[PDB]
Amino acid sequence: VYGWSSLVTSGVIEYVDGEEEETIMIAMTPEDLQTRSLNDTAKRIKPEMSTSSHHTFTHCEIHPSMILGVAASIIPFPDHNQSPRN
Amino acid sequence: IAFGFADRSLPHFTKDDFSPESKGFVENSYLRGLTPQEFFFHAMAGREGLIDTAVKTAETGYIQRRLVKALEDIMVHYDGTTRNSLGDIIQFLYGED
Amino acid sequence: EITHAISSAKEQVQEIIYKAQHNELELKPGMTLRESFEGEVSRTLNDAR
Amino acid sequence: GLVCPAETPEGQACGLVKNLSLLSGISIGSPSEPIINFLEEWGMEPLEDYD
Amino acid sequence: SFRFCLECNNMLYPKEDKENQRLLYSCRNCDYTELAEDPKVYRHELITNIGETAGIVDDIGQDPTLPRSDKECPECHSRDCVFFQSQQRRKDTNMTLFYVCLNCKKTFRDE
Ligand SMILES: [Zn+2]
Ligand SMILES: [Zn+2]
């Protein structure tokens, strides 16, 4: 059976703890891996990412929404609220 | 936002990044929605505010209780003076008027 | 207009960073360079908001 | 990514009781002997001959 | 700085011989004494700056967390280098940066 352990042992997904995170570079989304060359007021503003001419990413987040817990995963659109309300 | 990691607020930023987005500036509004870094920074600020309120209310309650215990037995008499339970005069006239 | 104001503020913050990184930032009396830079950046961001 | 930032109990338990993030895990524990053998195989030098 | 005993492997301290009017270094874990060639005994300066680059390593190039700049290297004329502020954490440490080139493996300032 090809499952999560198969993904881990194939060298495409790896576990990192809090102390290892000190020494890695992480991208929020796969779209951040490739630098683009728009002008829509409806969407949010992504970080400029202009401190370095080029970025050498070592890992990419599976999905940012996974940083929440079980209780917070029930809130619809938690990014549109004040944190004390959450 | 302090550098919780090694010279960076989050692992997604390079070392020594003093740009506004790197240290906790939320360009987007609540209507637009917050990026994950902005969401985390907002959560940090909210938690700090909750802790500060929770300690401030207790400190104020203790101060108020002590103040009430201090001035419990002060009463204005019929001659206009303000005396304690022992009869000692605190003010010769309440509020000087 | 809001986007233009925010972009101008970010450019001003970048200019402040460049001035600080070359020892070309004026030092407020009785307080060090790093906290002066942080105070200037915070004032700029608050004015932008 | 390890604990939930949004949630915390209200009151004196705030900041002391946490819930793990939705993908977090706890290490079980592994013997260190294979690690030592792998290190020694790859040119590691002990402290005895360390100047 | 200071010297060690030649056979005691112990700590040497300055002292005077008045039969010769001279300064020597002696060990009371032993009886050996040697000629001190410097009348200097102690240094203390209140203004200190050393500790700017600190522990730079030849392996700093493969660090992925460091930002990479496009500054032209002085002698090898490369257009690829990393930069970082001073490693000293003193309260009045300057924010001037050090640039390490990934080609010639050396550091340079922004002057
Ligand atoms: Zn000796
Ligand atoms: Zn070079």
Q: β-strands A59-60, A26-27: how paired?
A: parallel
Residue type at A50 in one-letter notation? S
Number of domains making up chain E: 2
Nearest Cα to E2, choosing from D49, E12, E10? E12
Based on the fold, state whether residues E105 and E57 are members of the same structural domain. Answer: yes
Chains in contact with C, counting 3 or more C-beta pairs less than 8 Å apart as contact: A, B, E
Residues E95 and E50 in one domain: yes
Residue ranges making up the domain that contains E30: 1-44
Burial of A3 (0-12, 13-18, 19+ CB in 10 A): exposed
Query: Cβ–Cβ of E92/C21 closer than 8 Å?
Result: no
d(CA C23, CA C33): 9
Query: Which residues pair with residue E35 across a beta bridge?
Result: E24
Q: Residues for chain C: how many in total?
A: 49
- Do E49 and E37 share a structural domain? no
Whether E86 contacts E59, CB under 8 Å: no
Binding residue positions of E for Zn(2+): 5-8, 27, 30, 73, 76, 101, 103-104
Question: E106 and E90 in one domain?
Answer: yes
Q: Which residue has the tokens 């390593």?
A: E57
Q: What is the sign of the dihedral through the CA atoms of B41, B43, B47 and B53? A: positive
State whether E38 and E52 are in the same domain: no
DSSP E strands in chain A: the ranges are 26-27, 59-60
Residues E92 and E54 in one domain: yes
Neighbour-count burial for A4-28, b at 16+ CB within 10 Å, e otherwise: eeeeeeeeeeeeeeeeebeeebbbb
User: In chain B, which residues touch A (CB < 8 A)?
Assistant: 5-6, 11-12, 14, 17, 19, 21-22, 27-28, 30-37, 39-40, 42-43, 45-47, 49-50
Report how far residue B32's alpha carbon sits from residue B28's, in angstroms, rounded to the nearest whole number.
6
Q: Do E67 and A52 touch (CB under 8 A)?
A: yes
Coil/strand/helix, residue B79: coil
Contact B9, A47 (CB under 8 A): no
> Tokens 């005994």 correspond to what residue?
E41
Q: Residue B44: its chain D contacts at CB < 8 A?
A: 5
> At E81, is the secondary structure helix, strand, or coil?
strand
Residue E34 and residue E70 share a domain: no
Closest ligand, as measured to the CA of E6 = 1
Alpha-carbon distance values, E17 to E25, E35, E49, E109 (Å): 10, 10, 37, 49
Q: Report how this structure was experimentally obtained.
A: cryo-EM
E57, amino acid identity: V
> Are residues E72 and E21 part of one domain?
no
Burial of B58 (0-12, 13-18, 19+ CB in 10 A): exposed
Residue E9 in contact with partner chain C when CB distance is under 8 A: no
Chain C residues lying within 8 Å of B18, measured CB to CB: 17, 41
Record: contact E66-B17, CB cut-off 8 A? no
Quick one: E101 and E51 in the same domain? yes
D3 CB-contact burial (10 Å; exposed 0-12 / middle 13-18 / buried 19+): middle
**Subunit partners of chain E (3 or more CB pairs within 8 A):** A, B, C
- Resolution of the entry in angstroms: 3.4
Helix residue spans in chain E (DSSP H): none
Q: Are residues E6 and E50 in the same domain?
A: no
E96 shares a domain with E78: yes
CATH code: domain of residue E79: 2.20.25.10
| Token pair 């999560």: residue | A4
Cβ distance B89 to B83 under 8 Å? yes
* Shared-domain flag, residues E106 and E55: yes
